[PDB]
Amino acid sequence: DSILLGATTKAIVMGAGDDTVTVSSATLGAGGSVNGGDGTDVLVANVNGSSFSADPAFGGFETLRVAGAAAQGSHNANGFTALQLGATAGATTFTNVAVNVGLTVLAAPTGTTTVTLANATGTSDVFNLTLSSSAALAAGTVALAGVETVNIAATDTNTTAHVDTLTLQATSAKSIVVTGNAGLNLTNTGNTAVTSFDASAVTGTGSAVTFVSANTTVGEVVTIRGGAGADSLTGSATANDTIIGGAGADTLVYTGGTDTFTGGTGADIFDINAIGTSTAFVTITDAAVGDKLDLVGISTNGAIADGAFGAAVTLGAAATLAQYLDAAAAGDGSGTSVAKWFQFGGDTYVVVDSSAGATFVSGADAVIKLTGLVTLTTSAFATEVLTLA
């Protein structure tokens, strides 16, 4: 059953089953009560602040939802087992939130949604955020200070695919796990403790996940996992990122350091935006027919080949990696950068020469490793984009 109440004078009962009362005023009147009865019942606060647990006038409720044209401000979560959020008048804050209590956002709110837990002090703090809508949902900013694992469910209620959006502010989260069946473009700015982003369980044709690590710990191991969608995963220059797309047209971005890329099934694009060193470079584990290698961001001097540029550099039975690099960079890349490639020790390498001498210079010349023997003979350069043939 489901009603709206104001400053009621009478004893409202809701009976069994999953009921819903929306209140327009925080305290009742005369006397002046509302009992949710048996089952999981939602109380909707269309008000400037609440403390329903304290008032014995309200009883039998399990879920607190902040939604309505007057819904706003500070709300005492105490004694609720779940939380919900809808459209709001202004910034709304949940205080005294017990452990294993999750928030479900159901519609775009107004202003930053702050969650502050009963006790944030431990180092194993878990929060369950849910996004649940038929259409694309702009969840806005939710702040979760002191939480270490943030779980996000992105849920689509209908059969037709969409992508939700969220700014998360979770400055001590080490893990973010995304589940669900809709896409999530997640704004991640300033969430610098994050070393594991796992959206791998996500499900549709295009439940597309976007993520960019804000991590700046020098020499960190960061793990970034995409889902079934056409995902857009960027690491950190600071970090040794392991990035893995799922199914679908994934874009994996290189920024610096020792990175390990695996675009799974589908036409993946490995977008190389940094030069790297001779030790800190990107290894692409599963480069296959259809995958692309976007070298626009290493065209230091001009813009790459543009041909089908495809005869492997060949050296002797025991030529060294150092030798093959120097050999590949032999030409002049001062006015115009050039691509070459070779196969050493069972793996395939691609080079960009941006220099004078026949030394591969660690700084401005670039190497990219590809696990296995992959023949790039027949494969062609689009703009500065190599499509594997």
State the residues that interact with Ca ion by CB under 5 A: 14, 19, 36-37, 39, 41, 53, 58-60, 120, 125, 146-147, 156, 158, 160, 162, 170, 172-173, 226, 231, 235, 239, 241, 245-246, 248, 250, 255, 257, 259, 263-264, 266, 268, 271, 273, 291, 296-297, 329, 353, 355
Report in angstroms how near the CB of residue 100 gets to Ca ion at its nearest.
Answer: 15
Report how far apart the first and last C-alpha atoms of the chain are (Å, whole number): 61
Report in angstroms how near the CB of residue 355 gets to Ca ion at its nearest.
Answer: 4
**Closest CB to Ca ion among 50 and 89?**
50
**Closest CB to Ca ion among 51 and 88?**
51
Alpha-carbon gap, residue 193 to 10, rounded angstroms: 52
Report in angstroms how near the CB of residue 172 gets to Ca ion at its nearest.
Answer: 4
Alpha-carbon gap, residue 18 to 29, rounded angstroms: 25
Report in angstroms how near the CB of residue 133 gets to Ca ion at its nearest.
Answer: 7
**Closest CB to Ca ion among 196 and 273?**
273
Known binding positions for Ca(2+): 1, 14-17, 19, 36-39, 41, 53, 58, 60, 62, 120, 122, 125, 134, 144, 146-148, 156, 158, 160, 172, 227, 229, 231, 236, 239, 241, 246-248, 250, 256, 259, 264-266, 268, 271, 273, 291, 294, 329, 331, 353, 355, 357
Alpha-carbon gap, residue 325 to 238, rounded angstroms: 25
Report in angstroms how near the CB of residue 38 gets to Ca ion at its nearest.
Answer: 5
**Closest CB to Ca ion among 51 and 89?**
51
**Closest CB to Ca ion among 90 and 357?**
357
**Closest CB to Ca ion among 80 and 343?**
80
Report in angstroms how near the CB of residue 69 gets to Ca ion at its nearest.
Answer: 25
Report in angstroms how near the CB of residue 161 gets to Ca ion at its nearest.
Answer: 6
Known binding positions: 1, 14-17, 19, 36-39, 41, 53, 58, 60, 62, 120, 122, 125, 134, 144, 146-148, 156, 158, 160, 172, 227, 229, 231, 236, 239, 241, 246-248, 250, 256, 259, 264-266, 268, 271, 273, 291, 294, 329, 331, 353, 355, 357
Q: Helix/strand/coil (H, E, C) string of the chain?
A: CEEEECCCCCEEECCCCCCEEEECCCCCCCCCEEECCCCCCEEEECCCCECCCCCCCEECCCEEEECCCCCCEEEECCCCCEEEECCCCCCEEEEEECCCCCEEECCCCCCCEEEEECCCCCCCCEEEEEEEECCCCEEEEEECCCCCEEEEEEEECCCCCCEEEEEEECCCCCEEEEEECCEEEEECCCCCCCCEEECCCCCCCCCCEEEECCCCCCCEEEEEECCCCCCEEECCCCEEEEEECCCCCCEEEECCCCEEEECCCCCCEEEECCCCCCCCCEEECCCCCCCEEECHHHCCCCCCCCCCCCCCECCCCCCCHHHHHHHHCCCCCCCCCEEEEEEECCEEEEEEECCCCCCCCCCCCEEEEECCCCCCCCCEECCCEEECC
Report in angstroms how near the CB of residue 117 gets to Ca ion at its nearest.
Answer: 8
**Closest CB to Ca ion among 89 and 368?**
368
Alpha-carbon gap, residue 240 to 283, rounded angstroms: 11
**Closest CB to Ca ion among 46 and 210?**
210
